[PDB]
DNA sequence: TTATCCCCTTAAGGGGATATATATATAT
DNA sequence: ATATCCCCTTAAGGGGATAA
DNA sequence: TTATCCCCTTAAGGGGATATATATATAT
DNA sequence: ATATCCCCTTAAGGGGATAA
């Protein structure tokens, strides 16, 4: 996949994956035990999103992250 | 690098690098435009840190972040 | 005190006191009229030390020396 | 016995003990493996006598020494 | 017996100094 | 605040052994 | 569904500083 | 060169829930 360098770049990448699998945000939120709300919050306005939050999103998406070189 | 699954994890990994390249929290603070306490704050208690700061660090630390399966 | 049977013995005992009363080789050197190297010389290699010095120390160290059976 | 505070005070104490037991200096010297000579040296002029020497004298005299308080 | 005296070599203790260790101040 | 080192002068103690 | 909006409490990140720790100079 | 603390201003995310 692609490397990411900004708050938004990221949330944008998640949404893609979300929709591409057809998972209702409300349903994603339920699994990790949060509000379909905060998932929106994250999806529209990521800059002020916390990390635990972010990471929870990640797990629900059956995804994971990794560091690497700033090309 | 390895597979990161949480804040304190991403924090341990990021800290590990900070020292390895010899860098400290101050020299990287001025560089990317933020407070020194912030970074330290991130390293020991990363949970509530915002995403904007997580990245100001990635660029000061000058490493990327891609995702995997 | 205990029963002393040799130079390195009398040296170990005498040194032990020097530190215990907090004293050092210099402060006791000036006091009894001799060189600092001398005392140190006595403490690690006491065998060839002269009797005059052994006593300048006893009086600076301010302890006596009697004999027993 | 008496406490001792000087090179001579000492050698003097030894001589007493030597004679009081009737031990020829030559014989004392032989036991500790030295010269009846150095025993004289020690006996007449102690200030410049070494310690090992002194201690050897002591053993031949079946004596021993101890530290104590400068009253 | 034991007080001295010869020859030889090993060093002590003083004068004059000094790198290291032992225990403590001070810089980011 | 110890342990060490240089240069020097002075004596120790072992070889081996004689006046007193 | 999903982008927003209310009420409440927990804190982050900045300004402005500072005792302690971590690694290093300096006094007898 | 870390971790911490004060005061403040600003937003997050959970309660619980409605326009679009």
From Swiss-Prot, chains A, D:
GO terms for cellular component: protein-DNA complex; toxin-antitoxin complex. Disruption phenotype: Cannot be disrupted, suggesting it is a functional antitoxin; no visible phenotype when the hipBA operon is deleted. A hipA or a hipB-hipA operon deletion show decreased biofilm production in the absence of antibiotics. Residues 18-44 bind DNA. GO terms for molecular function: core promoter sequence-specific DNA binding; DNA-binding transcription repressor activity; protein homodimerization activity; sequence-specific DNA binding; transcription cis-regulatory region binding. Residues 14-68 form the HTH cro/C1-type domain. It comes from the Bacteria. Degraded by Lon protease in vivo; half-life is 17 minutes in wild-type cells and over 200 minutes in a lon deletion strain. In vitro degradation by Lon is Mg(2+)-ATP-dependent. Degraded by Lon protease; degradation is inhibited in a HipA-HipB complex and when bound to the operator consensus sequence dsDNA. This is Antitoxin HipB. It comes from Escherichia coli (strain K12). The lineage of its organism: Bacteria, Pseudomonadati, Pseudomonadota, Gammaproteobacteria, Enterobacterales. The gene is hipB.
């Amino acid at each position: 996949f692609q490397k990411i360098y900004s708050p938004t770049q990221l949330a944008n990448a998640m949404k893609l994956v979300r929709q591409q699998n057809g998972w209702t945000q409300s349903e994603l939120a339920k699994k990790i035990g949060i509000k379909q709300a905060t998932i929106s919050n994250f999806e529209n306005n990521p800059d002020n999103t916390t990390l635990t939050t972010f990471f929870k999103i990640l797990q629900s998406l059956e995804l994971s992250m990794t560091l690497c070189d700033a090309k």
